Write a protein that binds this DNA or RNA. Structure first.
Ligand SMILES: Nc1ccn([C@H]2CC[C@@H](COP(=O)(O)OP(=O)(O)OP(=O)(O)O)O2)c(=O)n1
Ligand SMILES: [Mg+2]
Ligand SMILES: [Mg+2]
Ligand code: NA
Length: 351
DNA sequence: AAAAA
DNA sequence: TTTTTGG
DNA sequence: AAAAAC
């Protein structure tokens, strides 16, 4: 007969071939509105419903189709019913016409602007980016200044040839200071995505000392600053503790990507958002798993570990509360096995 | 908002 | 019913 | 020291 679809993204295979985009585009909009209205509960319920539909191997064409699918309560089934009716969501249409929603989308599209700043600007009466940028009283963070200066490039999204060009630059800068270092692209591109808002990398070295591990991101970014390629840089020192804003040493960057490096109407360069993460060699599988994503896959991995296995998972470790021991892993497959989960390939984590 | 405690 | 929802 | 990144 059939198998039961789990409520956990970590127990589903989600590939990029989405047969239910009509439903998930509507659910993504309704979730985003609840995120903006700080209704965390309703937001998460629409995110989970969107996630589960993305895992289906077929399109929903009737309400009978939704039987046995978890994460679809009465409210969500009303939304699906409405889309089956006319091909549109009246609920999502009303959100798209809402002035608070339109302003939040527009303002947060700027690097450096999140929910609090977007809400502040809206309550001040600002509706356009032109009126924000030209205001003489407003004060902008260094992140927002970079967000406005490179807006058109950052708003456009990175493609695979650009991501590969960035990978080459990262690898050649990293091996200059740590020749045995392992550089892995993570993030959407590792999950098989054609585009992304940024390019993320995990860096680890089997030999390097603590001090060498600490200095790598500083050495690599100076090197780029010397070449005039570092457009923005923010290095966060590690808040990870060997024995919970807890993270590995990382940096949020904007790099100048010369067009010649990508395999010229305007300047032969594009501003690219790049994130680098340095982790100790023994925690490389936990970091890789945390940074591969998707965000929904990571949420559910942690939720499943806690509620179903009485385990605690994060980007640095896996702890078993019953056995009172930290579980160690040399690969992602070993983490899945510790959790009692079937291995989900990176391209199947697009939840 | 949905599911579990 | 109240609590949880990654943390 | 809230905020923005994960
Ligand atoms: N809230 C989040 C955000 C991210 N991550 C992990 C999973 C993905 C990874 C990347 O951060 P993003 O770059 O925003 O992820 P993305 O998957 O690469 O999507 P996009 O490529 O379009 O930015 O970090 C996480 O555990 N929790
Ligand atoms: Mg990314
Ligand atoms: Mg990123
Ligand atoms: Na932003």
């Amino acid at each position: 007969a059939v198998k039961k679809i789990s409520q956990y993204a970590c127990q589903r295979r989600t590939t990029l071939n989405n047969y239910n985009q009509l439903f998930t585009d509507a659910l993504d909009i309704l979730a985003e509105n609840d995120e903006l209205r700080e209704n965390e509960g309703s937001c998460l319920a629409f995110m989970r419903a969107s996630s589960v539909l993305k895992s289906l191997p077929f399109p929903i064409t009737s309400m009978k189709d939704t039987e046995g699918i978890p994460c679809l309560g009465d409210k969500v089934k009303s939304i699906i019913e409405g889309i089956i009716e006319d091909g549109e969501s009246s609920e999502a249409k009303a959100v798209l016409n809402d002035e608070r929603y339109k302003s939040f989308k527009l303002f947060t599209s700027v690097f450096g602007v999140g929910l609090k700043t977007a809400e502040k600007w809206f309550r001040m009466g600002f509706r356009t980016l032109s009126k924000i940028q030209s205001d003489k009283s407003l004060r902008f963070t260094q992140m927002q200044k970079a967000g406005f200066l490179y807006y058109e490039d950052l708003v456009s999204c990175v493609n695979r040839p650009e991501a590969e060009a960035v990978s080459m630059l990262v690898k050649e800068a990293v091996v200059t200071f740590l020749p045995d270092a392992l550089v892995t692209m993570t993030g959407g591109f590792r999950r098989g995505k054609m585009t992304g808002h940024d390019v993320d990398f995990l860096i680890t070295s089997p030999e390097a000392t603590e001090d060498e591990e600490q200095q790598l991101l500083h050495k690599v970014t100076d090197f780029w600053k010397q070449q005039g390629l570092l457009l923005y840089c923010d290095i966060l020192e590690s808040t990870f503790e060997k024995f919970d804003l807890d993270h590995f040493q990382k940096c949020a960057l904007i790099l100048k990507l010369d067009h010649g490096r990508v395999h010229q109407e305007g300047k032969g360069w594009k501003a690219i958002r790049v994130d680098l993460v340095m982790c100790p060699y023994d925690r490389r599988a936990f970091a890789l798993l945390g940074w591969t994503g998707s965000r929904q896959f990571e949420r559910d991995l942690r939720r499943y570990a806690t509620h179903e296995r009485k385990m605690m998972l994060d980007n640095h470790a896996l702890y078993d509360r019953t056995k009172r021991v930290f579980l160690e892993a040399e690969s992602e497959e070993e983490i899945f096995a510790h959790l009692g989960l079937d291995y989900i390939e990176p391209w199947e984590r697009n939840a």
